[PDB]
Design a protein around this ligand. Structure first.
Ligand SMILES: Nc1nc2c(ncn2[C@@H]2O[C@H](COP(=O)(O)OP(=O)(O)NP(=O)(O)O)[C@@H](O)[C@H]2O)c(=O)[nH]1
Ligand SMILES: [Ca+2]
Ligand SMILES: [Ca+2]
Ligand SMILES: [Mg+2]
Lengths: 164, 78
């Protein structure tokens, strides 16, 4: 079957792991346990197609080894939190990093605004839409806590790879 | 400061765990296995020996995890 290698990138504490684990195990991780390196594998059916998802959950805090997995990945989930302006601003650097490694401006990506269950919003939807538009990618809001948009974020990333 | 252990999981998955004072091998791999739909009491865990390629030494789940800091482990099915 088709195997999609997805890489989840973004600043620390935005909910990269919470999203991934919610997708894999339908469980919300309430605690904050910073990631070093975590890979997950899941067999799913996306649009009538039996898919094998290989997902790499990366470290937000520093750490290099980034270039290594950025060459492997076919699709990138760029995550920020809507209650974390700085994390949203860091997205550009992640995009540039992916752009350099793959030497392309046509890398399958999806911009993800997480923690949409919170009312402490400092990043407006329109702002993120503009950022995504400049990259040529979709923008999706999610909540790993309420499962909102989670499947949609990942499945959209698969469908973006299919276009490329 | 780096008190970590690289672990190769079944189905070609992998994780790096953090080790803290008093943790057993079971206590530091508990979460990583659960979220991937695996029970510890269904898997054998091994240490991959230095200076070789395939050298595999079986461990006990109640082993102090501090003893394995900086090492690479492998979890398999039974
Ligand atoms: N309210 C709310 N909290 C969330 C949501 N997603 C994650 N969190 C919380 O935010 C914290 C960080 O989650 P985590 O997934 O570890 O973020 P991360 O990006 O993986 N961190 P790291 O880069 O260090 O691995 C956790 O306490 C988690 O419960 C969400 O959608 N809503
Ligand atoms: Ca682009
Ligand atoms: Ca504003
Ligand atoms: Mg994480």
């Amino acid at each position: 079957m088709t195997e999609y290698k997805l890489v989840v990138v973004g600043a620390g504490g935005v909910g990269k792991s919470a999203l991934t684990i919610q997708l894999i195990q339908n469980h919300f991780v309430d605690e904050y346990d910073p990631t070093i390196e975590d890979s997950y594998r899941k067999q799913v059916v996306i649009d009538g197609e039996t898919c094998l998802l290989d997902i790499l959950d990366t470290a937000g805090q520093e750490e290099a080894m980034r270039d290594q997995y950025m060459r492997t990945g076919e699709g990138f989930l760029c995550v920020f939190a809507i209650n974390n302006t700085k994390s949203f601003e860091d997205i550009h650097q992640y995009r540039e990093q992916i752009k350099r490694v793959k030497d392309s401006d046509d890398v399958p990506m999806v911009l993800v605004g997480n923690k949409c269950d919170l009312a402490a919003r400092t990043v407006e939807s329109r702002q993120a839409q503009d950022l995504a538009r400049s990259y040529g990618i979709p923008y999706i809001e999610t909540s790993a806590k309420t499962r909102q948009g989670v499947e949609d974020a990942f499945y959209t990333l698969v469908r973006e790879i299919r276009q490329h | 400061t780096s008190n970590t252990i690289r672990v190769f999981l079944p189905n070609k998955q992998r994780t790096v765990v953090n080790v803290r004072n008093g943790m057993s091998l079971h206590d530091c791999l508990m979460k990583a296995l659960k979220v991937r739909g695996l029970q510890p009491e269904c898997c054998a865990v091994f240490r991959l020996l230095h200076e070789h390629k395939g050298k595999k030494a079986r461990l006990d789940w109640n082993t102090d995890a501090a003893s394995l800091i900086g090492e690479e482990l492998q979890v398999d099915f039974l």
